[PDB]
Ligand binder design. Sequence first.
Ligand SMILES: [Ca+2]
Length: 262
Amino acid sequence: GGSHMRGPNPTAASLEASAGPFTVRSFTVSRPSGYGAGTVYYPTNAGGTVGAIAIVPGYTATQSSIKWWGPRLASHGFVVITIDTNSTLDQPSSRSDQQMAALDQLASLNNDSSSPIYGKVDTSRMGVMGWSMGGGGSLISAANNPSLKAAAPMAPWSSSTNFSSVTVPTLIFACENDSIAPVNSHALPIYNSMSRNAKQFLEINGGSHSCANSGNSNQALIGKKGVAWMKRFMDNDTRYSQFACENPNSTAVSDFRTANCS
Ligand SMILES: [Ca+2]
């Protein structure tokens, strides 16, 4: 598909800032199809079509826990939907279905001349993210939909750790002191199961289960890595290779691993 480069050349400082290069606006989805609710964040001035990312919260949680990713990613050139699930008690498989339904709705709104994102989406370039059970659902989405270009589960919770089938580039954020989805029985065995993909594991030092959520104390680092990963793999943009693949050399990181990254 070639590359899909948007925006000025990245620097560490420009990726650690809270606001990327593009102005962002948002709207709530009027008739969500297959999920509970969504807010769509989009760049007004990206200079070309951009890929789409759907983000799912955790069990009992709402969009507030994942909201910060909307403007953070959209401002670098992505259409991002943060969803609420049909019920906040939905399990990971249901969360995956709703995540994929939200991406499909972004593709439909791209066809809709009355939508703010009419013609703004390259619907062939999509990614998945989520927290906790939504991170589990993101891994299910990636396993079931290898056409996805990237995945970034955060403090994932899953009953099964075997994601050996996944071929999608996957960045797993983990939280060192997680007591809800302990790293040793969730994020790390999940990470080790994947032998068929580019992958990365970033464990946040001292982090509780909410360490990648809105209001976290490491938005510079986490946001830099999330954006860099999505830019590298959703846009095929090798200006981001070093940022996506590098050990961040951060006292904020207690464990860093990566494989097959370029
Ligand atoms: Ca520590």
